[PDB]
Amino acid sequence: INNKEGLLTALRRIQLDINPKTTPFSFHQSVVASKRTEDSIPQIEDDLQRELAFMNQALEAARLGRSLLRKEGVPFTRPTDYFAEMVRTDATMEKVKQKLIEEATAKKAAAE
């Protein structure tokens, strides 16, 4: 069952006003896409084309948001002089590095 009127009356009870003329982009930071991204993915089992489609959808969201955020004037670029908490700890960021060192040194030893 899809009580399409019922979703509408429930939705307007929740809704906060998101209008670009009235509320700035700093409030919501949400972007809808022009394409529906189902046309971008022909086959779901195709892994590389699927991740490229999700990359490309957030690609335009990152570009469209950056233009709207620079105009409004809040900072966007993290300074080189700034350090804070990270979603992954420094220890997790280390063994990410030697995952690529042993992958790089394997292909150089394979060539050597």
Binding site: Y82, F83, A84, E85
Partner: protein, 100 residues
């Protein structure tokens, strides 16, 4: 009734630091005059520079609130208040944990 999403008096995140600094080690912002950034993005600087005679007197006789810890908010070392020191003593002794 709609829930009013305010922070209660007993909540863990009732008071937050201004410095937007978590469990990051304070070895950073040592070679940098500033210490941390605030919510709006502007910069937070070290308050002042301690005197050599004051530091020598602090090394000979440490204060009551001295802990040897660098404050995540200011470049000066963090010192416990009188009420905080009394709270630690009442917790350790346990004779009166709560007043009245």
């Amino acid at each position: 009734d709609e829930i009013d999403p305010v922070y209660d008096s007993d909540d863990t995140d009732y008071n937050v630091p201004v410095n937007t600094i978590g469990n990051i080690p304070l070895s950073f912002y040592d070679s940098y005059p500033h210490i941390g950034y605030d919510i709006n993005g502007k910069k937070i600087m070290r308050p002042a520079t301690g005197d050599a005679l004051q530091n020598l007197l602090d090394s000979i006789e440490v204060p009551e609130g001295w802990t040897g810890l660098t404050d995540p908010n200011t470049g000066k070392p963090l010192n416990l208040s009188r009420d905080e020191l009394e709270l630690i003593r009442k917790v350790q002794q346990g004779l009166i944990p709560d007043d009245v």
